[PDB]
Design a protein around this nucleic acid. Structure first.
Ligand SMILES: [Mg+2]
Ligand SMILES: [Mg+2]
Ligand SMILES: [Mg+2]
Ligand SMILES: [Zn+2]
Ligand SMILES: [Zn+2]
Lengths: 820, 823
RNA sequence: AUGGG
RNA sequence: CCCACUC
């Protein structure tokens, strides 16, 4: 994407302007001021394009060989242009430096802060004119923006007797117009040197001024102080040609429309005949412009962007479009504080897993970095298998890894370690990676400061300079940059993205539980309904903690009752409250129990007693809590519950938000829900499949989900499937994932052992644990029935060649591989 | 409060600027620039003060006696100053008219729209500076505001210029014409001495560079250096004394105003030293260095160039005041509906509102209708709004010499305030009317939020029977009149009057509708609910709307919906509107309701289990199918001395508290809150302590501030029966004069045995100048009954007569706007 | 012929 | 000198 530019390989868009004279004394002295104006304009449009296109560097060549910036300054008209381009301070966006015979102007990206008008893009001139009293004022960016917002939500005696001059036809010589110019009246006189091109150049800024503000009459052929009518000789210009010229000129004036009818600008052009002693003398031309509905331009706006490495001018429609233009930003401070703290205790390498893998694979890398970063009292280094891939651009096999250094009083450095020293693509790779990383930090993270990324290449067995303003001055800039990094990684998919998404979901669960806990004081018996992918177990744990906090009771007096033993073990590892299985709850003695929470009441079996009646008798000796969590889409046991009929299941809620899966997993869940609703099954009643809405599910999905991967393969063999699993596992472990991330689940339990053996061979070509091993550092290989209520970040679903996709997707967070 | 101004009695603040020359050519051809600048400046300060202080009219005397505005124009320098004061449009705020030898400038009130930045006031020049590259730019109003919010929100390069310049102070000895190797940048500025005057020009120039230094990055300023040569020439021995030193500038720089978002309040720091110049190792002169460190907050070169009106004088704004006024409800949501249902902008005829006050006026005076009809004629559209005193409506003055006021609003016409006088011999009417118009206009802007140009022209009419404004001050289309009437609705909803009372009642109707819409969600989430209601929540309307929702959500006839209450009067009230059965609890028992599907029960607190179990009966009816058993409870309004059949409060789930819904006045709500606090401090016996814990004062504060409206609550004590009757008769007569109706008044006696007596004692006092029982609310009569029989119903005006205590809550609950507690 | 640097 | 309205 970037050019070659071997002389200065800056990781930015570089605009070369040519040869420019510099120096205050030098600039004050020229002949041929056209060259001076052109040299000012070129740099100004370059600055405008760079402000509107994400920043960059401007390259100029110095004519004076003995020139020195510290002794000659910069100029005087250039500073005036800078003031007229950046009214609220030009220092925050421009810097100047001198590399020998080169003058470099560093331009920051234009982004308004939280204390400013919402002015999205920078312009020299709005080029849409307004009328104040009698002068046509070219509006500024802010004034034009206010006018656009005005039209989006959609003294006088001079206007009289102007239409009277419009009405009459015959004129003698030297009529003293009794009315002077006003908002609706303005006049000029002809120029005998050139008439038609002067009218070309002069009409637009009055036609636009009238069309914008009320409506007016342009009179041409009238003097200022004498207030008479003069005109030019008839032989100089034919009136019909002039009228046609005026019509075609007005038709070419750019226009924007907030309405739908798209009317053209309505004007009336008339020619008169100024006589002299009953002899034809000349013409006076009158143009009446009514108040137009929407904004009328005189020329294209003085705004520029960068397209195809060229400084181009924005059109009217484009200019108006970009002129008028999440929970990540709410929790980014906490995420940065917990994941990327800014301390003074040496330098910390992140993430721990990938760094451990890289340092175990190569011992010299740790010392090589600890010597390269030195001298640095404090800082942060973030590693990645491919920072280009993490951003989402490219993946190079010749690169071992990339590191990012962020520290105070220092710029940001991008280290690129190469497996092979003589590979000729390292420098371009590092430069482009720095460019795309900075661009993503700006356009996504929201970093409005000044920062630079320096590419550096490094070999296993083994200089650009910026303005000092482009270095992280203090710790606050470090925090802002790291929060932008948090946003950028949460927007992408990688190992760090997965870990930070887990932290994000943990933060969101607390808010959801706090909101849910308000119903504790409003209800005693409740029937909570949960969508596919809600994580009812974490909600239940937080609810038990809140019950213990609100009702001042011993944790032993709160009973969690579930169906599966693995979920019970997970829960007793989590909460101090008592947790029993359904079979233990029955044929059991519970006399000192006040509050009961039931999860997985879907699969409760009534073939051993009435569990609902037992719970009601326990909570109704005092009136205790009897909250039931139900997800009617996850019924596996072929038995009815002790549940009362759906009409008697009141009061109830419908937890819609709580989707802590990837976007594609949520898509699969939504499609499966639609399929189930279209063709209801036997064990799911129509009444219960009516409280879940697809629109609400989509709204909850595009408020908490994060990017991930779902991939389905069909018509595969056992050995091929095992090899696929082994290869994907190997790639993940290389990228930094842990064994306690992955879980392989087979639909049929009897297919476990076989699928185990083919696994042990596959990983041999390139240790599995039961369902009570999800907290250990091993890959879990079990069945869907035995894995109910648990979850892991990467899930491999094995099933022979069908509404059970949802049971697989409910067990996964970011990666779901469905192999048939 | 306005001045006399017999010549032009505008209802505006008029600023007389003096004897001023006008003309596009008359100002050009004129010497004595000290006069041109003075007149331009005076007019500009007047415009700025008017813009920042509500608008008005500037009056000037034109120099040329042949001057005509349409011929001679306004000028060029004045127009440029107008452009520099209002960057985005001046026609929106300034109009000009000529009356004889007077030029009047009509100045609108600067009010930022929903588009522009929050620039609250207009500024000619902020006078706080910035650095840029090598410059000192006076910040515009917008950029200055940006800087204030930013500051309160708390091989060679350019930076090399600081080096080789920070070491200039260390150069204690200096030799004549030494070259300087650094050029001007963001950290250095040097100026050349002036031979004629040295001190005054230094003092003029220092503040506006010290401001930029202290406001952008710091730095230092030299004096004695040339721009074209970088000399060290400086002054001489005989023209500069050692008096000009650090101490001398220690007062000039300290004269600069400084604001501070900080608490340390540090004065600006500067150090001055003298570098001697040596022409051939001989002293020749001195050059000056002043080092200015950057400031934590803003530093002002001068006082800001902003003006307001104080004591009818154009008064300059200091830095603190300027920065303070630069950085500084559901009525606006419902005003569109209120205006379209109360003031429909149509063309069928002229609408005289309010109707009750108009009826009283037209019955007290038969000829008022014809005089009014002739006053606006010829006309086709508009609304005429009548009042007993429009000055008193906006809360300023009540006059016994004025019969009534009329406000005419029409398309292609300005607002006209008519003042009707009983006796023309009264001389002071004119001023009154004028002032009133002024006040009304201001209320339409500060309170009503109106932005466009409007003028209120006062006229004086007698029973036994010209100000000029710009054309732009007349209403243009129907949308303009709609916005003006919406502003009027907003203004009146914050005042106390008849029109305010009716608007508040309809406001309460809309609020109740939205509250019931919110409450209808719980019909999808539960079957039996225990709704706990604050005092003054108007639960009966909620119940009516709830059955309206049940009839649709469950597609069933109104027959299978039941209302259960305690009083027969409220049963009739409810059965008046609702199509469902509405029977009291006594007849609900000893009866059979087999077709009933859903039951809504009101006044559940005073239900008595002396005839069985009503709760079990309702439960068994609703539990044959699972029906709805919503129960509304008000624990603070227990009257009956009976034990309910309700389940214990620990078994009254699921439950919800309707905290919001306060549809009374601010003072009535305050009385309610005080009674709540008194009750909670000393709990009674008929209410369980557990139930007196679901109610918090803060939520009541929020609801009252969000929904209540200003009203009247007066308590009189130590009175006899005749005095109370006289008070009631006088208040009723005065209210009927104001335009009220008997259907808004309820006189309630605590003890029922006091009723008959309080009838006769009343009827005498009223006869000095027909009643209804509590079951007469729907009739057009004044009800005189007890609060026990009026429980559950409401009236706008309540007279609570009580013998000489926790029962003020009932009286406050039956009242909407006016409460008069007589003991 | 009008203001800001 | 630079810039803005301006015949
Ligand atoms: Mg003009
Ligand atoms: Mg002209
Ligand atoms: Mg300078
Ligand atoms: Zn349009
Ligand atoms: Zn401070």
């Amino acid at each position: 994407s970037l050019k070659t530019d071997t002389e200065m390989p800056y990781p930015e868009v570089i605009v070369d302007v040519g040869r420019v004279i510099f120096g205050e004394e030098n600039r004050k002295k020229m002949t041929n001021s056209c060259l001076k104006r052109s040299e000012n304009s070129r740099i100004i449009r370059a600055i405008c394009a760079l402000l509107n296109s994400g920043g960059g560097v401007i390259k100029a060549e110095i004519d004076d060989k003995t020139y020195s910036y510290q002794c000659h300054g910069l100029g005087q008209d250039l500073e005036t242009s800078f003031q007229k381009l950046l009214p609220s301070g030009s220092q925050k966006y421009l810097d100047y430096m001198q590399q020998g015979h080169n003058l470099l102007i560093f331009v920051k990206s234009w982004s308004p802060d939280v204390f400013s008008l919402p002015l999205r893009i920078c312009s020299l001139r709005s080029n849409l004119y307004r009328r104040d009293v009698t002068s046509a004022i070219n509006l500024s960016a802010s004034s034009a923006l206010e006018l656009l917002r005005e039209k989006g939500f959609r003294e006088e005696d001079m206007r009289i007797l102007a239409s009277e001059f419009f009405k009459k036809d015959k004129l003698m010589y030297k009529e003293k117009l009794n009315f002077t110019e006003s908002t609706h009246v303005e006049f000029k006189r002809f120029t005998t040197k050139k008439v038609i091109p002067r009218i070309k150049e002069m009409l637009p800024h009055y036609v636009s001024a009238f069309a914008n503000t009320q409506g007016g009459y342009v009179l041409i052929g009238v003097d200022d102080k004498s207030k008479e009518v003069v005109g030019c000789k008839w032989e100089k210009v034919n009136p019909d040609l002039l009228k046609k010229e005026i019509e075609n000129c007005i038709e070419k004036l750019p226009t924007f429309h907030f309405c739908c009818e798209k009317p053209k600008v309505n004007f009336t052009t008339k020619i008169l005949n100024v006589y002299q002693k009953d002899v034809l003398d000349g013409y006076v031309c009158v143009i009446q412009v009514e108040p137009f509905c929407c904004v009328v331009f005189a020329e294209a706006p003085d705004s520029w962007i960068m397209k195809d490495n060229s400084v181009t001018r924005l059109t009217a429609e484009q200019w108006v479009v970009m002129m008028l233009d999440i929970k990540v930003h709410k929790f980014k401070e906490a995420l940065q504080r917990h994941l990327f703290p800014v301390t003074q205790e040496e330098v910390q390498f992140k993430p721990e897993s990938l760094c451990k893998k890289l340092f175990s694979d190569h011992k010299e890398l740790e010392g090589l970095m600890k010597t390269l970063i030195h001298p640095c009292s404090q800082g942060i280094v973030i590693f990645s298998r491919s920072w280009a891939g993490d951003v989402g651009f490219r993946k190079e096999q010749n690169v071992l890894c990339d590191a990012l250094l962020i520290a105070v009083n220092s710029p940001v450095v991008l280290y690129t370690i190469l497996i092979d020293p003589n590979w000729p693509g390292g420098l371009e790779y590092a430069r482009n990676t720095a460019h795309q990383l900075k661009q993503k930090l700006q356009t996504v993270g929201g970093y409005t400061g000044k920062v630079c990324i320096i590419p550096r290449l490094i070999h296993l067995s083994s200089p650009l300079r910026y303005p000092r303003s482009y270095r992280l001055a203090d710790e606050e800039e470090m925090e802002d940059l790291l929060q932008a990094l948090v946003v950028v990684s949460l927007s992408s998919r990688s190992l760090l993205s997965d870990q930070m998404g887990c932290e994000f979901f943990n933060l969101l669960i607390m808010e959801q539980s706090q909101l849910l806990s308000e119903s504790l004081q409003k209800t005693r018996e409740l029937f909570i309904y949960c969508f596919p992918g809600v994580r009812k177990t974490a909600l239940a744990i937080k609810i038990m903690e809140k019950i213990k906090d609100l009702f001042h009771c011993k944790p032993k007096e709160i009973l969690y009752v579930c169906e599966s033993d693995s979920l019970k073990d997970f829960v007793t590892q989590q909460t101090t409250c008592q947790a029993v299985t359904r079979k233990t709850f029955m044929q059991g003695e519970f006399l000192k129990i006040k509050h009961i929470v039931m999860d997985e009441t879907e699969n409760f079996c009534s073939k051993y007693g009435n569990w609902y009646m037992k719970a009601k008798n326990i909570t109704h000796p005092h009136h205790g809590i009897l909250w039931l969590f139900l997800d009617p889409f996850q019924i596996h046991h072929a038995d009815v519950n002790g549940l009362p009929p759906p009409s008697a299941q009141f009061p109830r809620k419908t937890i819609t938000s709580g989707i802590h899966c990837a976007l594609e997993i949520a898509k699969v869940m939504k499609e499966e829900m639609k399929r189930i609703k279209e063709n209801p099954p036997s064990n799911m009643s129509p009444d219960t499949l009516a409280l879940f809405s697809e629109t609400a599910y989509e709204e909850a999905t595009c408020a908490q989900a994060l990017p991930g991967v779902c991939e389905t393969k069909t018509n595969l063999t056992t050995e091929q499937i095992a090899n696929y699993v082994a290869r994907k596992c190997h790639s993940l472990f290389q990228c930094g994932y842990l064994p306690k991330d992955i879980a392989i689940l087979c639909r049929r339990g009897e297919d476990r052992g076989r699928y185990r053996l083919a696994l042990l061979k596959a990983m041999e070509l390139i240790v599995f644990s039961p369902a009570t091993g999800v907290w250990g550092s091993h890959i879990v290989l079990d069945s869907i029935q035995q894995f109910s209520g648990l979850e892991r970040t990467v899930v491999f679903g094995l099933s022979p060649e069908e509404f059970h996709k949802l049971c697989f997707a409910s067990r996964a967070i970011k990666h779901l591989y469905l192999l048939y």
